[PDB]
Amino acid sequence: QQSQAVAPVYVGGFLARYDQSPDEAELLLPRDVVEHWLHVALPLNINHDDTAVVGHVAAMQSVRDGLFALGAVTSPRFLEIVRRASEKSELVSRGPVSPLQPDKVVEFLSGSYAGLSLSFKHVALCSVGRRRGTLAVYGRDPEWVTQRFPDLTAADRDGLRAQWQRSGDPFRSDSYGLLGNSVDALYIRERLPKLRYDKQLVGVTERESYVKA
Amino acid sequence: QQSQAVAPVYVGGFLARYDQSPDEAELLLPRDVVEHWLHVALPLNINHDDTAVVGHVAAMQSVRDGLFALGAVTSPRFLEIVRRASEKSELVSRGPVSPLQPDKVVEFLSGSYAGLSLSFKHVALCSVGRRRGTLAVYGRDPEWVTQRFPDLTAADRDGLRAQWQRSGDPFRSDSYGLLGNSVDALYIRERLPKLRYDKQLVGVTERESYVKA
Ligand SMILES: *CC(=O)Cn1nnc(-c2ccccc2)c1COC(=O)NCc1ccccc1
Numbered sequence: 001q002q003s004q005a006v007a008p009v010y011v012g013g014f015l016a017r018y019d020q021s022p023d024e025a026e027l028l029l030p031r032d033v034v035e036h037w038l039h040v041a042l043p044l045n046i047n048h049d050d051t052a053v054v055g056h057v058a059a060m061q062s063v064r065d066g067l068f069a070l071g072a073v074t075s076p077r078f079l080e081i082v083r084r085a086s087e088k089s090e091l092v093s094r095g096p097v098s099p100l101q102p103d104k105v106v107e108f109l110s111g112s113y114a115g116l117s118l119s120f121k122h123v124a125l126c127s128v129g130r131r132r133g134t135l136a137v138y139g140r141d142p143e144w145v146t147q148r149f150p151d152l153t154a155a156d157r158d159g160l161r162a163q164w165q166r167s168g169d170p171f172r173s174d175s176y177g178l179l180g181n182s183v184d185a186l187y188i189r190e191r192l193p194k195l196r197y198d199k200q201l202v203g204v205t206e207r208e209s210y211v212k213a
Numbered sequence: 214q215q216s217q218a219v220a221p222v223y224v225g226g227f228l229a230r231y232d233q234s235p236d237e238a239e240l241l242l243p244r245d246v247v248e249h250w251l252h253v254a255l256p257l258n259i260n261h262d263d264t265a266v267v268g269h270v271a272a273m274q275s276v277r278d279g280l281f282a283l284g285a286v287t288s289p290r291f292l293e294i295v296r297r298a299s300e301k302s303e304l305v306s307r308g309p310v311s312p313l314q315p316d317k318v319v320e321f322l323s324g325s326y327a328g329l330s331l332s333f334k335h336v337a338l339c340s341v342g343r344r345r346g347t348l349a350v351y352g353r354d355p356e357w358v359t360q361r362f363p364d365l366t367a368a369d370r371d372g373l374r375a376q377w378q379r380s381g382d383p384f385r386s387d388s389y390g391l392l393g394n395s396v397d398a399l400y401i402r403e404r405l406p407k408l409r410y411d412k413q414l415v416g417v418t419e420r421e422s423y424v425k426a
């Protein structure tokens with residue numbers, strides 16, 4: 001009964017795509033805007049709840065199509081909550097596409113928090129992203145996540161790899177609070193279609209990913 | 214700090230509509246089929262988990278448009294889980310339509326478990342119903358639920374009122390398991406449209422209900 005499930009999980013995805021006009025004008029975030037900002041690491045939480053910090057952003061890099069980010073989900077307290085819920089979900093028990101090994105925790109995160117949202121203050125794991133192309137790809141190896149993204153070049157991958165190889169438990173929230181933001185996710189209009197769309201956009205598929213959408 | 218929130222909640226809705234052909238042929242359940250069955254009360258649980266019994270069905274009655282049911286959510290352990298999660302959800306904090314008093318718990322249940330599903334073995338509270346018209350209406354008074362359903366007649370309401378006026382905590386599941394079936398609900402195709410549809414069908418609206426869809 002070795003628990004090699006509550007070990008770190010990495011997540012990567014585009015925080016913003018330079019080929020996609022927002023739905024609202026307020027989401028517009030251009031290349032020049034973003035690169036000025038790339039100039040003390042910044043945290044990773046759930047649905048913008050500062051009480052629900054689960055890890056940190058390990059590397060961001062602006063590339064041709066947008067702003068890529070790759071975080072680490074390190075919080076023991078959070079990963080353990082995730083582990084207990086995934087034992088209880090039918091979507092997880094159906095497992096990934098045959099070739100991929102079953103990873104109950106990586107799948108659960110893949111299902112629940114399928115999007116990325118940049119507010120830099122911090123990065124959040126949403127149910128979906130508000131901005132298109134914000135697909136969140138979870139995995140046990142930092143190099144595994146990055147390689148799902150075709151638009152990323154070898155040289156791109158090397159800029160990231162330099163960063164992710166460059167104080168207690170930061171998760172003060174709990175099962176009841178994640179339960180709380182789960183029903184909120186149910187009422188996001190066209191959640192799946194939006195997600196199926198980001199999948200086609202950044203080039204990821206489920207026969208190469210734990211993406212559940 | 215009086216907790217008049219973890220008190221009983223009632224839920225009513227059509228288990229099956231006699232004017233709606235199923236999507237699959239296997240859901241067909243006709244009037245004659247149902248009335249033979251009306252001939253020891255039957256339990257009410259969450260997503261067909263027998264470990265997650267939250268109460269019981271207090272009255273069923275076949276009427277012109279279908280099979281109406283009205284249950285009671287009595288489980289202290291479950292209602293308390295629901296109370297803690299609703300404090301943590303943005304949809305609940307936005308409250309019902311102005312006239313309706315805020316009821317964090319009744320709203321949370323309204324959002325999470327918006328559908329009814331009959332498997333009689335037992336009735337389940339789903340995210341959505343598989344059968345159309347299975348809209349689950351939650352409320353603090355048994356008579357309040359019934360009166361949201363226009364198709365129900367006075368005489369219909371009197372048949373029910375006779376039944377709902379006619380052993381420990383039955384919830385052995387917990388926060389982690391409801392968390393588990395929450396992400397499963399996210400991947401039900403056209404969840405909202407299906408729900409907005411049942412709303413129009415059985416005649417309920419949100420300006421008269423805690424329905425969040
Ligand atoms: C990642 C975020 O910034 C949070 N978020 N993700 N998707 C949405 C959203 C909500 C409505 C319509 C489209 C997208 C959000 C917004 O979060 C909020 O501040 N509002 C809370 C809320 C969310 C869903 C339903 C009702 C209220």
Ligand SMILES: *CC(=O)Cn1nnc(-c2ccccc2)c1COC(=O)NCc1ccccc1
Pocket residue numbers: 090091260261329330337338339340341342343397398400401402
């Ligand atoms: C009330 C129920 O009987 C459970 N339920 N509610 N909606 C669905 C459903 C699932 C897929 C497509 C349409 C409707 C279900 C079915 O529950 C299951 O047995 N399958 C588990 C599951 C649910 C959602 C997504 C993936 C797997």
